[PDB]
# Entry
Amino acid sequence: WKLYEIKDGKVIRKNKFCPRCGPGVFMADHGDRWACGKCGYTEWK
Amino acid sequence: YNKRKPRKFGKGARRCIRCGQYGPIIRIQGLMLCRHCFREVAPKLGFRKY
Amino acid sequence: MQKARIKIASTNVRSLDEVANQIKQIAERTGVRMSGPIPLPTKRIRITTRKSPDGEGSATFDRWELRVHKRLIDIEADERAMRQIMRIRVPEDVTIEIELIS
Amino acid sequence: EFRYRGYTLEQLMNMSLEELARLFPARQRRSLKRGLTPEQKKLLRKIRLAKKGKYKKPIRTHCRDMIILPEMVGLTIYVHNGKEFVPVEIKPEMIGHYLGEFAPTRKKVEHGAPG
Amino acid sequence: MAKPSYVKFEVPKELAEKALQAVEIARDTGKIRKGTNETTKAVERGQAKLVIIAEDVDPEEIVAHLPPLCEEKEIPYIYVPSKKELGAAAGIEVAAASVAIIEPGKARDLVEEIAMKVKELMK
RNA sequence: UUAAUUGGAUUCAACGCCGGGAACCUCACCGGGGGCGACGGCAGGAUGAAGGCCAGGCUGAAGGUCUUGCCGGACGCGCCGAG
# Structure
C-alpha cells in the first residue's frame, strides 16, 4: 500500500513494474538500477 | 541445502531397501538388499540348500 | 515352410513337464508336425555369503542355488495349431516366449 | 633466472592455456583439459582479478587440488589443510604442482618409549 | 466523530450491513482479497468488482488511496463503520482494513444492487 | 603420533575380522560453515512469508551472514510439554 501514491485522481507507482511477471511486481529502488529479486533481474538506469 | 548430493558411484550411491545399510549390497542380477538381510529371505526367493 | 520356436522356462520341473506334455497333446491332436522338446541347458545361479552377521567366528560360508530349466519346442506352421496355444493354462512360474522363423 | 620447459616465467605469462598445459605433465594437463570445477573457476577469477588489485580481500581456498599456473606467481593463498587455511607463498617454481601437497594435513609424528 | 478525509459519501447503516453480508457470501462461495495491499493489487489488475473499506482505520494512509483508486478504475467502493466488522465478515480473527471481492459468488444480487446504492452515493 | 587414525573385537574361539570395497560418500573421526524441533497452549497476526534475490563487504562457496528492495501471494517464529 505504501508503494502507491495518488495525486489528481491518478495512481503513481513508487517503483517500476517488472515486465517479466506482470502488474503488481514493483522494482527495487537502488538509484543506479531497477532490480527485482524474484529472479534477480536488473535494468540499469 | 539439506538434500544429499547425487552420487552415481561409490558406497553412498547404494543403500539397502530393507534396513538401509550402505555397505554389503550384493548385486548378482540386481538384488539390492543387504547381505545379512539375504539370510532370512533366500528361501522366500526360492533358494534351497544342496 | 514356416516354423514357430517356443522356449518354456521354469524353476519347477514338474510344471515344465506338464506344460510340455499338454503342448505335445495339442500338437498331436491338431496333426501338425512338432520337433520334440529339446531340453536346453539349465541355468544354475549361485550366490555364496558369510553366515555370521558380524565379523566374529570361523570363516563360515553358505551356498544358495537356483536351478532354472528351459526347453525348446519347434512346430510347423498351422494357424489352427497356433490358435490353441494361447488358451494353454500357464503356471505363474513358467514363462513361455514364442518367436516366428521363416 | 627461472627456466621451465626451456622458457622463463615472464615468457610463460604470454602463452595461451592450451600450449601451457601442453608443457605440463600428463596428469595436470588432463585435469585442465577435462575442465576445472565451477568452484575452481570462481577461485581462478578471484585470484586473477586479485592480481589486478580490485579484490583486496585476503584470498583463502579449499581447492587443495588447484594447479598453480605461471600467471598466478607472486601472490599469497591460504589453503585448507583440514582445520585451518595455512598460507602458501607463490614463487616462479610453483608451476606444475598441486596445492594439497604443500599444506601440512598430517603433522610430524615423533616416537617415544613403547607402551 | 469526524468522518475521515478519504470519505466521499455517507453510507447508511443498512447499506453497510448489506456490504458486510456481501463480503461474507463472497468469502463463502466466491473469492475475496483481504488487506488493502491485495485490494490495490486487484484494482490495479482490474479484477476487483467491489471494494469494502473500513471507516475506523487508525492510519489514514492505508485507506487514503482507495477511493480515488477505485474511482479512476471505475469499480464501486463502499464503506463499513468498523474494521472489526469487515474482519469478521471476511472470516478472519484479525481486523481487515479493506476487502476486494473478485468472485461475487452468491453476493452479486447484493453487490450489483449495492452498485447502484454506491453510484447514487457519489452523485 | 595425530586434527583423526571412529568405535567394536582377545589365547585357541580378534588379528585380508565387523568392511561382500578407507580418493567427496561409506561417516559413526577431526576442524570449520550453514540449517529446520512437528503437534496442543501463550503471545503475535496479513498494516504482507516464513521463501526467493540481485549490487556487493564478510563466508571454502551456499541469501550462508550482513546494508539492500522489490517479489509469489499467503498466517509463522520464542518458550511450556513434546517429539
Q: What stands out?
A: The CA atoms of residues 8 and 96 of chain C lie 4 Å apart. The beta strands of chain C are 3-10, 34-50, 61-76, 95-101. The first helix of chain C runs from residue 13 to 29. The helical segments of chain C are 13-29, 79-83.
